[PDB]
């Protein structure tokens, strides 16, 4: 196509150990949602992972609600949401 | 298993059981035992020498009339053959039973003679059944045919009687 692309294959062949978690981070960045719901015929590690993801979502929602209910400045909605998300994800 | 006779060379003076220094039980456990005799002749040694010299010169088999099958191809075909589990119908069972009966009577008759390769055994019956099932597996059929048992009995006969009688 003419665009410039780095030699990812040689970089993998030289330093594959770092590229393992690089691929893992990229895969977790765009992970599709499961079509089938979880059930009783499902693995124990899988239900643990589902509970961990739901628990993380509950932490994020609860901290967002507490910080928004504090109402520090009482005042740009999108920038406010971005800053609140960043402070929630860092705290 | 690969083995030599008692003196290292087959001699027709003694019985086949004598120079196959091998107990009757462990002999009966082998389904097929081949006597591989090195009988000299003017014609066969010519063709053997031509074959061996061609292999040594060209690093390949002599005959160009057939393409030999690659080991991976043989392996996958043998796996797919091993997936099969052939069975036997009443007629082929009856033929196997008759062949077993005649084999045991022949082994009774040749026991006193010097041409004995042993005494016929139910393990020989089971070996015939297993060779027939393997031959049916090569044909990729769920049934064992009459020709499979024909080939099995022919193989048992040519293993011992054919080369020794010549």
């Amino acid at each position: 196509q003419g665009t410039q692309a780095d030699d990812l294959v040689s970089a993998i062949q030289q330093n594959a150990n770092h590229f393992t978690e690089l691929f893992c981070r990229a895969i977790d960045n765009n992970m599709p949602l499961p079509t089938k719901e979880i059930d009783y015929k499902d693995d124990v590690l899988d239900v643990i992972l589902n509970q961990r993801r739901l628990r993380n979502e509950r932490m994020l929602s609860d901290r967002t609600n507490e910080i928004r209910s504090e109402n520090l400045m009482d005042t740009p909605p999108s920038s406010m949401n971005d800053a609140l998300r960043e402070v929630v994800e860092d705290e | 298993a690969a083995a030599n006779p008692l003196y290292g060379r087959y001699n027709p003076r003694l019985s086949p059981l004598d120079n196959i220094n091998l107990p009757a039980a462990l002999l009966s456990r082998f389904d097929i035992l081949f006597l591989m005799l090195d009988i000299p002749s003017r014609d066969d040694d010519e063709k053997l020498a031509e074959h061996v010299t061609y292999v040594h010169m060209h690093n390949k088999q002599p005959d160009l009339d057939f393409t030999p099958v690659e080991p991976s191809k043989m392996r996958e075909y043998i796996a797919y053959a091993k997936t099969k589990r052939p069975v036997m119908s009443e007629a082929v069972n009856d033929y196997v039973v008759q062949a077993y009966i005649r084999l045991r009577q022949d082994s009774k008759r040749e026991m006193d003679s010097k041409f004995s390769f042993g005494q016929a055994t139910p393990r020989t019956l089971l070996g015939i059944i297993r060779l027939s099932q393997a031959l049916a597996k090569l044909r990729l059929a769920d049934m064992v045919d009459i020709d499979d048992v024909e080939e099995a009995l022919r193989l048992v006969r040519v293993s011992k009687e054919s080369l020794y009688q010549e």
Partner: protein, 48 residues
């Protein structure tokens, strides 16, 4: 030639009931004092 292993934590259970003399509860009460104190009508400490 491996790295230093890292240790992290995640809140799951309620745990033991909080006590007033605990440092975390004193910090939380002080934080609520800063955020929620009103002199007349304004959060003077929050604005300060």
């Amino acid at each position: 030639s491996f790295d230093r292993p890292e240790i992290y934590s995640a809140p799951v259970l309620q745990g033991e009931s909080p006590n007033d003399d605990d440092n975390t509860e004193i910090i939380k009460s002080f934080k609520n004092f800063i955020l929620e104190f009103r002199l007349d009508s304004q959060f003077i400490y929050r604005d300060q």
